[PDB]
Amino acid sequence: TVYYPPRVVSLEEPELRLEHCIEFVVRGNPPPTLHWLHNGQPLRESKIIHVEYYQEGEISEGCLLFNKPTHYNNGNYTLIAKNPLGTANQTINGHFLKEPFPVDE
């Protein structure tokens, strides 16, 4: 492969960042796999929606984070966790922003 030594392209002074966090803690042995649903549908993650772990393994702890969510992010969020001995799912309601009034009759 083509090698080259390390280079820091960018490093910036601190900037404030407001995000909404859906905090979770899951236990399971063996360590469970985690999947999210938004209103029963599979959640599409990105740079706006990202999961951060403070710890993984038998105890998984962290946040599903929202950077600048819209009203479309409103609704139910379900966390499904599965391992060979079972599955588990819990649902919470997330309200981020006001749902606009309807424009049509």
UniProtKB/Swiss-Prot annotation:
Organism from which the protein derives: Homo sapiens (Human)
Localisation per UniProt entry: Membrane
Modification after translation (UniProt): Ligand-mediated auto-phosphorylation.
Disorder cited: Defects in NTRK3 are associated with susceptibility to congenital heart defects (CHD). A disease characterized by congenital developmental abnormalities involving structures of the heart. CHD are the most common major birth defects and the leading cause of death from congenital malformations.
Tissues where the protein occurs: Widely expressed but mainly in nervous tissue. Isoform 2 is expressed at higher levels in adult brain than in fetal brain.
Function summary: Receptor tyrosine kinase involved in nervous system and probably heart development. Upon binding of its ligand NTF3/neurotrophin-3, NTRK3 autophosphorylates and activates different signaling pathways, including the phosphatidylinositol 3-kinase/AKT and the MAPK pathways, that control cell survival and differentiation.
Residues covered by the Ig-like C2-type domain: 10-83
Disulfide bonds: C21-C63
Name of the molecule in the record: NT-3 growth factor receptor
Family the entry assigns: Belongs to the protein kinase superfamily. Tyr protein kinase family. Insulin receptor subfamily.
Positions annotated with a glycan in the UniProt record: N76, N89
Quaternary structure and partners: Exists in a dynamic equilibrium between monomeric (low affinity) and dimeric (high affinity) structures. Binds SH2B2. Interacts with SQSTM1 and KIDINS220. Interacts with PTPRS. Interacts with MAPK8IP3/JIP3.
Recorded coiled-coil stretches: none
Shown residues within the full chain: 300 to 412 of 839
